Design a protein around this ligand. Structure first.
Ligand SMILES: CCCCCCCC/C=C\CCCCCCCC(=O)O[C@@H](COC(=O)CCCCCCCCCCCCCCC)COP(=O)([O-])OCC[N+](C)(C)C
Ligand SMILES: CCCCCCCC/C=C\CCCCCCCC(=O)O[C@@H](COC(=O)CCCCCCCCCCCCCCC)COP(=O)([O-])OCC[N+](C)(C)C
Ligand SMILES: CCCCCCCC/C=C\CCCCCCCC(=O)O[C@@H](COC(=O)CCCCCCCCCCCCCCC)COP(=O)([O-])OCC[N+](C)(C)C
Ligand SMILES: CCCCCCCC/C=C\CCCCCCCC(=O)O[C@@H](COC(=O)CCCCCCCCCCCCCCC)COP(=O)([O-])OCC[N+](C)(C)C
Ligand SMILES: CCCCCCCC/C=C\CCCCCCCC(=O)O[C@@H](COC(=O)CCCCCCCCCCCCCCC)COP(=O)([O-])OCC[N+](C)(C)C
Ligand SMILES: CCCCCCCC/C=C\CCCCCCCC(=O)O[C@@H](COC(=O)CCCCCCCCCCCCCCC)COP(=O)([O-])OCC[N+](C)(C)C
Ligand SMILES: CCCCCCCC/C=C\CCCCCCCC(=O)O[C@@H](COC(=O)CCCCCCCCCCCCCCC)COP(=O)([O-])OCC[N+](C)(C)C
Ligand SMILES: CCCCCCCC/C=C\CCCCCCCC(=O)O[C@@H](COC(=O)CCCCCCCCCCCCCCC)COP(=O)([O-])OCC[N+](C)(C)C
Ligand SMILES: CCCCCCCC/C=C\CCCCCCCC(=O)O[C@@H](COC(=O)CCCCCCCCCCCCCCC)COP(=O)([O-])OCC[N+](C)(C)C
Ligand SMILES: CCCCCCCC/C=C\CCCCCCCC(=O)O[C@@H](COC(=O)CCCCCCCCCCCCCCC)COP(=O)([O-])OCC[N+](C)(C)C
Ligand SMILES: CC(C)CCC[C@@H](C)[C@H]1CC[C@H]2[C@@H]3CC=C4C[C@@H](O)CC[C@]4(C)[C@H]3CC[C@]12C
Ligand SMILES: CC(C)CCC[C@@H](C)[C@H]1CC[C@H]2[C@@H]3CC=C4C[C@@H](O)CC[C@]4(C)[C@H]3CC[C@]12C
Ligand SMILES: CC(C)CCC[C@@H](C)[C@H]1CC[C@H]2[C@@H]3CC=C4C[C@@H](O)CC[C@]4(C)[C@H]3CC[C@]12C
Ligand SMILES: [Ca+2]
Ligand SMILES: [K+]
Ligand SMILES: [K+]
Ligand SMILES: [K+]
Ligand SMILES: [K+]
Ligand SMILES: [Mg+2]
Lengths: 298, 214, 462, 202, 117
């Protein structure tokens, strides 16, 4: 028996049940009018300070988030080399225990950002909330079931979008050029890796109307290379999508990914290399005089 | 890149508070789920159209075997061994001919449509298990179990006089469950998208009544 | 018309999965009856547009007339013959060109950006689908000089995918045209379709995503006061203001700061607001707009601060702009405390004639020229007093270094500011000199004055 | 001069169309002319002849035909090879008979191919049927045949592979496009110039 | 006219040269690696190469053919990328609001001019 749907159901149920609970609470709050500084604000302020880097504990938490995002991405990269669905012992799988701990920390960081949030519904629809709903619940389900599906785990790469924000929190990024460069690099890499993971999932699991018989055995790095070739418009043709869903995804990505590549790669290359050629200072020579000339130089 | 990296000489009442922005984002989401559900319904509908008609056009029948025999010729199956390892092994060909409910004439039995398409010249294929001896043993085992089935029990069979004109199948190759899930979950996406819009408008309009009440 | 165009396109999409020519019973084919009715409606809509036309010959040569001549008659012939050919039925996709026009008729599309976006999307999609249908027809029916033997069995969606790959210039080579007519069509499409893709896809992506990041409105918090700041907002102006407002030498104030400005903040201002994430909020709007003033909740703000551009080219223009801002804020809410910077003194006199301008309630016009010339005059009574006064306002921490230099002593002196607070009943009934010599080093506090209200250095008789 | 009203714009669009049809017709004539050139010369260079069979025999070797079964289903079946040799009107020497140029090109080593009908037995039966009908045709009636000493140097055909009707339609309808384009220009200029005379008459 | 003439003549000439070079093989390979390419096939290959589509169904295989392809990729893509947009801009420069009003018998009309916004 296969269990792929249990992981996916846990994410869908989490995202939409939370959204419906929030909307029902709103509805019923106003409906009570038909029948008819606080500690809440103090904990909201404390959570907002923790979320920012205004304290030592907040800085430690932000650095931990930065490290654990890369850790989870590396864990997904390790798992991407295995079969699509498998049975594996939680008590004897160090990577599953490490993932379990990482997702505990992300659940806690999610809880802190929820408490700190001003508009809950606005928070529930912030995309790094969506990234947590589509990546945290399936880890819990896997650790409970003693089984894993390599399903939507490529969405972990979207965690790189917050890197510039948490670098600005840590008082590291100050200049506009550096901020823009980090933003562009993060968006480019996360988009590339996420799209590669999705096309990897879709190619390795065939079309349902073809009874999953036309699947193509493509590795994650092969899909990454194919996406790079497609984005740059080189189009070698050695590697390409063959399933109907894969090609349907390829068509929608060709509209967005080429505009991203054509826009971001020149701008990144302009932002880098902005070095001053004439820097440094003169070194005096003993026994030889020197003359400084300034004013109208042409 | 594309067109010299897009260059070419530079060719080309408000009483509601902050909650308004979260609610307008909730309308957006609910609308996007409505569109997604409808679009995916059409996409899956075009993909299922030919398989579903090729399946619907095949009628159920009652069958009985006329004969079981070998044609003396042999064919390659592929046998597998981890990473990418494969080689080929022979199997002997059986043919089986069967009584038919629509044409009342000779047709050749093929266990399923994948067997028909992988070797239309032959009636059965063994799962390739290394050596030729095990393929021949497994064909002889299936052959003996089919040869004595003479009118024992008119087993049901699937036929299509328009595209399997003298070929007959023992199974449907179209899983009803897989089709059901392909049309159910886009419908669920659409219903969830409607409920999100409805609850968002219900909350938005009750906020105005609860404001005017004060 | 809008619905039936999509209906006919969907009917063509259904038929594109069948053989190229076939016999089918009109009395037993629901799709052929539906197509029959759809084409009746298009014949009627064509007749109405013909009657409404001014120049008939101009109408006969309008391309949606041509699209009807190439799509309506063959449906009639098919319904008469009880047979169908999947011929020029892909021209139905050209019906999407009129979508923007009929949306403008229905008073739906009004803005230029939305009209342009709809036009570009319609032209792109219709061109793509029509070209895909034509290449599908040409590939599935081979070359006449090759006796139709070199035909390639390509599905319509396969041709759509091939066209997308060709337009974007990716050119995988997995799917390509093989017939001579198909390649001849490919060559002419490569000239036009790549120029369309290269032009339209960036422009569409620019038109979408034009969202305002700083929208919404401030949400007041019970028990906590907030302050609205407007006028000259820039990285250095906000950075200097926040250093003085949020300094650790004040007591534990939790006043929120809300900025209102009509320019989107640059990346360095957004980083400055992120470094103050729990104490500063920014909202993009105009102070002259009552909607924006309601958005920043200025009716419940404790005060409104209006910073001025001290280095402006035109002091008169800057004073006029600040006067207009004050007028707008007072007009929205007369009872709002307003603190503003005024470059000149005659403009300050102009401003204080406002009916809602109440200096007693706390309206302070900080006149820069007046205060600086007064500070210069006090330096004429005692040299160094301008420095003495200026350092009493700026919030400064103690700074200490090991070097014995004049700077150490100077910084030690600079560490003090002027404050104001109520004093103990244990000092009521004493003389002002007496409480001063008491406070001086026992409490470590120096008094310049007390609340006949504001009295600078009282005598021994008070 | 601009006494004509709005009708001027419809008539200038009608001139455009008539000119575009003239250009289309001429361009398509050249395009079809270049595409038909090699097929038409390869057909013209093959002369009509009178033939008679020298012998009918099998070479004992067998070949694959492909047999078909809906969607994409195909497999292969053997057929036995006949060869047939024939008297010739241009070289007066041995040549091998090939029923048509597609048969010559699909298997130049062999004289006939059966339409593949599933099993080998039906292919062999259909070859034996054709073989027996050809073996007794000895001088019975000098059947006409097609030959080309320059590109089918010892090979002979029973049929022309070039349909005259398909070529006729490929050159006729571009000519019709051109004639219609001329008549549209002519009637548009005739209407435009008579409108000026009917205006000056008032 | 200048752009169209230069584009077409360059395209056809380059196609003819690559046709000559592909049909007559390399002298160091003793003319044995020749590729039987028709002139129109070479024209199509040049168009595919210029537009940067690069299907790969048709390509040069001889050493001289590839050496020619490398030098043409430098010039022909810059020509295509520059000329095709400029030609497409030059065409289609039509005035949408032309023509003239047609009076209707029995109905009056009013002409409005000056500051129109
Ligand atoms: C904060 C730092 C963040 C950055 C990084 C921290 C990442 C944490 C996880 C590292 C892997 C640790 C581990 O359990 O390794 C496993 C081996 O696999 C390896 O040793 C992988 C070595 C290749 C490079 C990674 C242990 O062996 P296993 O239990 O048999 O492996 C199970 C999974 N597998 C079979 C798919 C390999
Ligand atoms: C660990 C990462 C540490 C980053 C340090 C950043 C830093 O110091 O900024 C500097 C380097 O300028 C940049 O930040 C741009 C160079 C690229 C940074 C890419 C970071 C990873 C992005 C994700 C990629 C995907 C990963 C998978 C400059 O920043 P600044 O604003 O000029 O700082 C003020 C100058 N001062 C500090 C000298 C006074
Ligand atoms: C912290 C830094 C972490 C390092 C990140 C870099 C990670 C890059 C690591 C690449 C691993 C290579 C896989 C090789 C392999 O398994 O063979 C596969 C082909 O593999 C390819 O085709 C390689 C394609 C290059 C991918 C370029 C990645 C650059 C992403 C840059 C951004 C990434 C961020 C095929 O395998 P097989 O034999 O057919 O399968 C049976 C066995
Ligand atoms: C064919 C593909 C074309 C994609 C066009 C997408 C719409 C873009 C758009 O601006 O719609 C707009 C309305 O629309 C809505 O309120 C619903 C948003 C979901 C639309 C999903 C379309 C697929 C989206 O809203 P907006 O203008 O982004 O306003 C918020 C800022
Ligand atoms: C205003 C709304 C506009 C939007 C849409 C309205 C479109 C109107 C036509 C819809 C099809 C109705 C119909 O007759 O279906 C047919 C099946 O085919 C389907 O049911 C197709 C299902 C796939 C998605 C479409 C009925 O079965 P049939 O008679 O055997 O089918 C004949 C054609 N066929 C064999 C090629 C399938
Ligand atoms: C059914 C279609 C409904 C379209 C609604 C349009 C609409 O409301 O316009 C809005 C969305 O802005 C747009 O119109 C742009 C978003 C893309 C629309 C694409 C429509 C389909 C095009 C064919 C694609 C191929 C299909 C196959 C904005 O329009 P506006 O001018 O700003 O309106 C005034 C604002 N007011 C109404 C809020 C006061
Ligand atoms: C057999 C094969 C047949 C296959 C394909 C052939 C089909 C190709 C379709 C050609 C039409 C494309 C087109 O340009 O339509 C035009 C309709 O014209 C108008 O905008 C004014 C009409 C009112 C719209 O384009 P445009 O508005 O001119 O362009 C916008 C920019 N302009 C305002 C800046 C200049
Ligand atoms: C209202 C919304 C309507 C939905 C519109 C979307 C309609 C899209 C629906 C696509 C249907 C997929 C066909 C699959 C198929 O039959 O297999 C074929 C391959 O098919 C492909 O190669 C798929 C290529 C992707 C096309 C992308 C369309 C996007 C157009 C977006 C604009 C469209 C507007 C091959 O078939 P076969 O097995 O070789 O043949 C024997 C059986
Ligand atoms: C005055 C107007 C004059 C008309 C000018 C238009 C002339 C165009 C005429 C093209 C003739 C087609 C040749 C077909 C052919 O012989 O088959 C060949 C493939 O042929 C192809 O691959 C066709 C490639 C399209 C070329 C596009 C030309 C456009 C140039 C536009 C600029 C041109 C100016 C292969 O042949 P074969 O069967 O492998 O060989 C054995 C037989
Ligand atoms: C080689 C391909 C080059 C294509 C060039 C097309 C001509 C463009 C042109 O402006 O001709 C012009 C003259 O022309 C006419 O009066 C007849 C219009 C049909 C010409 C068809 C050419 C193919 C077209 O007229 P125009 O200038 O569009 O004037 C109306 C606006
Ligand atoms: C508290 C909320 C967020 C939990 C999220 C819902 C998830 C966890 C729910 C939804 C459907 C549930 C699954 C439904 C069916 C099975 C199969 C059974 O053999 C073990 C339990 C298991 C595997 C359930 C596990 C929990 C489950 C996956
Ligand atoms: C975590 C998921 C599953 C449940 C979400 C909890 C929901 C039901 C509850 C818990 C606390 C509630 C919030 C408490 C405070 C506010 C601030 C008010 O100005 C708007 C409503 C809002 C935002 C409430 C909305 C509903 C709310 C978010
Ligand atoms: C539908 C096809 C088959 C026939 C079209 C009808 C023909 C015969 C007739 C009917 C109505 C006629 C039009 C009626 C009115 C005008 C306006 C006038 O100032 C110039 C002639 C013009 C433009 C006529 C042209 C010819 C016309 C279009
Ligand atoms: Ca101090
Ligand atoms: K390219
Ligand atoms: K390419
Ligand atoms: K390519
Ligand atoms: K390629
Ligand atoms: Mg706040």
């Amino acid at each position: 028996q296969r269990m792929w749907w249990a992981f996916l159901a846990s994410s869908m149920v989490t995202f939409f049940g939370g959204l419906f609970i929030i909307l029902l609470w709103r509805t019923l709050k106003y409906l009570w009018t038909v029948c008819c500084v606080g500690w809440m604000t103090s904990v909201k302020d404390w959570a907002g300070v923790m979320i920012s880097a205004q304290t030592l504990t907040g800085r430690v938490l932000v650095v931990l988030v930065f490290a654990l995002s890369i850790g989870a991405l590396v864990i997904y990269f390790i798992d991407s080399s295995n079969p699509i669905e498998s049975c594996q012992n939680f008590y004897k799988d160090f990577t599953l225990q490490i993932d379990m701990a990482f997702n505990v920390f992300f659940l806690l960081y999610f809880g802190l950002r929820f408490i700190a949030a001003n508009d809950k519904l606005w928070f529930w629809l912030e995309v790094n909330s969506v990234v947590d709903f589509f990546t945290v619940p399936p880890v819990f389900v896997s650790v409970y079931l003693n089984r894993s599906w390599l399903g939507l785990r490529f969405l972990r790469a979207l965690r790189l979008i917050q890197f510039s924000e948490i670098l600005q929190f840590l008082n590291i990024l100050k200049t506009s050029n550096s901020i823009k460069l980090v933003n562009l690099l993060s968006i480019f890499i996360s988009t590339w890796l996420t799209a590669a993971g999705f096309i990897h999932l879709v190619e390795n699991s065939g079309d349902p109307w073809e009874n999953f018989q036309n699947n193509q055995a493509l590795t994650y790095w092969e899909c990454v290379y194919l996406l790079m070739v497609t984005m740059s418009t080189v189009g070698y043709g050695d590697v390409y999508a063959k399933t109907t869903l894969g090609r349907l995804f390829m068509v929608f990505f060709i509209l967005g990914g080429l505009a991203m590549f054509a826009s971001y790669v020149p701008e990144i290359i302009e932002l880098i290399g902005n070095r001053k050629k004439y820097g440094g200072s003169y070194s005096a020579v003993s026994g030889r005089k020197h003359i400084v000339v300034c004013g109208h130089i042409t | 890149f594309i067109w010299t990296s897009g260059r070419t000489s530079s060719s080309y009442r408000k009483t509601v508070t902050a909650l308004k922005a979260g609610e307008d984002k909730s309308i957006r989401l609910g609308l996007f789920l409505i569109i997604s559900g409808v679009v995916s319904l059409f996409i899956f509908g075009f993909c299922w159209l030919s398989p579903a008609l090729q399946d619907l056009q095949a009628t159920e029948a009652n069958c009985t075997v006329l004969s079981v025999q070998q044609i003396g010729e042999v064919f390659e199956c592929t046998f597998t061994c981890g990473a990418d390892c494969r080689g080929t092994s022979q199997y002997p060909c059986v043919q089986v001919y069967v009584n038919n409910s629509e044409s009342n004439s000779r047709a050749l039995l093929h266990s399923d449509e994948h067997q028909l398409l992988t070797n239309p010249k032959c009636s059965y294929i063994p799962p390739c298990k290394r050596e030729n001896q095990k393929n021949l043993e497994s064909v002889m085992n299936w052959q003996q179990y089919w040869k004595d089935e003479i009118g024992s029990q008119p087993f049901t069979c699937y036929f299509n006089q328009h595209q399997r004109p003298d070929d007959v199948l023992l199974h449907r190759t179209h899983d009803e469950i897989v089709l059901l899930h392909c049309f159910l979950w886009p419908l669920v996406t659409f219903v969830v998208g409607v409920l999100i819009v409805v609850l968002t408008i219900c909350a938005k309009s009750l906020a105005v009544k609860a404001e005017a009440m004060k | 018309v809008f619905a039936l165009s999509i209906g006919a396109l969907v009917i063509y999409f259904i038929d594109s999965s069948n053989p190229i020519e076939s016999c089918q019973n009109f009395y037993k084919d629901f799709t052929l009856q539906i197509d029959m009715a759809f084409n009746v409606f298009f014949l009627l809509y064509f007749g109405l547009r013909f009657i409404a036309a001014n120049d008939k010959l101009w109408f006969w040569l309008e391309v949606n007339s041509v699209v009807d001549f190439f799509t309506v008659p063959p449906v009639f012939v098919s319904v008469y013959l009880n047979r169908s050919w999947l011929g020029l039925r892909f021209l139905r996709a050209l019906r999407l060109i009129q979508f923007s026009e009929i949306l403008q008729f229905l008073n739906i599309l009004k803005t230029s950006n939305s009209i342009k976006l709809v036009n570009l999307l319609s032209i792109f999609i219709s061109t793509w689908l029509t070209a895909a249908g034509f290449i599908h027809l040409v590939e599935n029916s081979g070359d006449p000089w090759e006796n139709f033997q070199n035909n390639q069995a390509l599905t319509y969606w396969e041709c759509v995918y091939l066209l997308m790959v060709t337009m974007s210039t990716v050119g995988y080579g997995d799917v390509y045209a093989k017939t001579t007519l198909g390649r001849l069509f490919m060559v002419f499409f490569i000239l036009g379709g790549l120029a369309m893709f290269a032009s339209y896809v960036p422009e569409i992506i620019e038109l979408i995503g034009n969202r305002k990041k700083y929208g919404g409105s401030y949400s007041a918090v019970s028990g906590r006061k907030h302050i609205v700041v407007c006028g000259h907002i820039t990285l250095e102006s906000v950075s200097n203001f926040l250093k003085d407002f949020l300094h650790k030498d004040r007591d534990d104030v939790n006043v929120e700061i809300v900025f209102l400005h009509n320019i989107s903040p640059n990346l360095e201002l957004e980083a400055l607001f992120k470094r103050h994430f729990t104490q500063v909020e920014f909202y993009q709007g105009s102070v002259l707009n009552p909607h924006d003033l309601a958005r920043v909740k200025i009716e419940s703000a404790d005060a409104c601060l209006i910073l001025a551009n001290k280095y402006c080219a035109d002091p008169d223009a800057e004073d006029a702009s600040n006067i207009m801002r004050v007028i707008s804020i007072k007009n929205y809410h007369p009872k709002i405390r307003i603190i503003t910077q005024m470059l000149q003194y005659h403009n300050k006199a102009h401003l204080l004639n406002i009916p809602s301008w109440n200096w007693k309630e706390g309206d302070d016009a900080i006149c820069l020229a007046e205060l600086k010339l007064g500070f210069i005059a006090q330096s004429c009574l005692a040299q160094g007093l301008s420095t003495m006064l200026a350092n009493l306002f700026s919030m400064r921490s103690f700074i200490k270094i090991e070097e014995d230099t004049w700077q150490k002593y100077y910084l030690e002196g600079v560490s003090n500011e002027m404050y104001t607070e109520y004093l103990s009943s244990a000092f009521v009934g004493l003389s002002f000199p007496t409480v001063c010599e008491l406070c001086f080093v026992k409490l470590k506090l120096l008094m310049i004055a007390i609340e006949s209200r504001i009295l600078i250095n009282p005598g021994n008789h008070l």
